[PDB]
């Protein structure tokens, strides 16, 4: 039912931003569209880390 | 210029007893205007008439003689239209004219 990373990367206008987990999104097309829009800042990287922030 | 904060439409009662301000959708407010014994203008607290999911195209105050002030409206309800995937409900929903009456006895606005 869901895209793999290769189809998603070709379907973006810009394929450098797509990550492993973006296919797990409920609307992956819009997510990779928003990640490739200008001047938006990315989600803080430690959202997936098990250790707490700055600890 | 918010979507639900009033200010867009403004209608006065032709005798001069109330004024009604409404937003494009779901928010209306009536103010009752009066004169004190020193001939100064006095204002009341707002009476509200709110109706969710409802668009207003125009609002005008109706000239009823000295009865309770009426306000007429070109309303439309988009609630059904956002729940029809086929798109029929957008096509055959229709605009209504609704009259709001300010009941000066009971201090409240009734549709």
């Amino acid at each position: 039912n869901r895209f793999t990373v290769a189809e998603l990367k070709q379907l973006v206008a810009r394929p450098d931003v797509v990550e492993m987990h973006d296919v797990t999104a409920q609307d992956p097309k819009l997510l990779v569209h928003l990640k490739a829009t200008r001047n938006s800042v990315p989600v803080p990287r430690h959202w997936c880390f098990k250790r707490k922030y700055l600890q | 210029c918010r979507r639900i904060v009033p200010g867009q439409f403004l209608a006065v009662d032709p005798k001069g007893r109330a004024v009604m301000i409404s937003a494009i959708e779901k928010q209306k407010l009536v103010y009752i205007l009066n004169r004190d014994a020193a001939a100064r203008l006095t204002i009341s607290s707002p009476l509200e008439a709110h109706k969710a999911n409802t668009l207003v195209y125009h609002v005008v105050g109706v000239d009823v003689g000295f009865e309770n002030p009426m306000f007429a409206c070109l309303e439309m309800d988009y609630e059904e239209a956002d729940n029809d995937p086929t798109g029929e409900a957008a096509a055959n929903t229709q605009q209504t004219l609704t009259f709001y009456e300010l009941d000066l006895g009971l201090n409240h606005v009734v549709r």
Binding site: - | L29, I43, S44, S45, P46, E48
Partner: protein, 105 residues
């Protein structure tokens, strides 16, 4: 208040009634609870000054002794536009204090 998460504002459409503050609450802001820089006067909704309640404290509910204001920062953020700022429930802290003193005394 900002110190009590379980308290709840009225938030109805405010009217021409001026909200007041009891001696304990004098000089503080109704929203963010600050002591400095008063910017605008507080208006309360009709139901909240009904009857005997006319003129009680907005924040706690005691006999009001001066007018309540919003501070400058709540004005700039337009927190003064959300509704009637009367607190409508006592909350856990007030109730607990009563039963504790009554147990002792």
């Amino acid at each position: 208040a900002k110190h009590h998460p379980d308290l709840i504002f009225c938030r109805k459409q405010a009217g021409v009634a001026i909200g007041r503050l009891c001696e304990k609450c004098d000089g503080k802001c109704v929203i963010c609870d600050s002591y400095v820089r008063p910017c605008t006067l507080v208006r309360i909704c009709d139901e909240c000054n009904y009857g005997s309640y006319q003129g009680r404290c907005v924040i706690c509910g005691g006999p009001g002794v001066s007018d309540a204001y919003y501070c400058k920062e709540c004005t700039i953020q337009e927190k003064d536009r959300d509704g009637c700022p009367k607190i409508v429930n006592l909350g856990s802290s007030k109730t607990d204090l009563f039963y504790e003193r009554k147990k002792y005394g």
